[PDB]
Amino acid sequence: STPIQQLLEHFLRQLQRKDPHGFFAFPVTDAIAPGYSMIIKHPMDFGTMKDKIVANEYKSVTEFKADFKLMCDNAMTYNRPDTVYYKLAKKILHAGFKMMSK
Numbered sequence: 001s002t003p004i005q006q007l008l009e010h011f012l013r014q015l016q017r018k019d020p021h022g023f024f025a026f027p028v029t030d031a032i033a034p035g036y037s038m039i040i041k042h043p044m045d046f047g048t049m050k051d052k053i054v055a056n057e058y059k060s061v062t063e064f065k066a067d068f069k070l071m072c073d074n075a076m077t078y079n080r081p082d083t084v085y086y087k088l089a090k091k092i093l094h095a096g097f098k099m100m101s102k
């Protein structure tokens with residue numbers, strides 16, 4: 001694997017530690033989130049991000065960060081603010097960018 005893949009695998013491991021329940025581990029299904037696919041146009045999750053690293057689809061750290069932000073923004077769009085998912089998305093968006101900045 002390439003230096004970028006190694007760095008992104010490291011960032012991904014550290015980001016997933018901030019989601020110990022694995023709420024962001026796999027794509028959101030409509031079965032657990034009614035109507036999700038009809039509301040969220042560009043779904044994202046950590047498992048898809050892992051597959052993109054392995055496929056070498058991220059050509060910059062910026063692209064990886066954009067998928068992480070997309071994942072969090074989706075949760076803050078579909079869910080109401082008084083939900084576990086909204087609250088965690090907001091928390092990990094900020095904490096995750098901080099972690100990747102230094």
Ligand SMILES: Cn1ccc2cc[nH]c2c1=O
Nearest residue numbers: 023024028032033075085
């Ligand atoms: C990320 N995520 C995971 C599960 C779920 C159920 C309702 N909303 C959500 C959500 O946003």
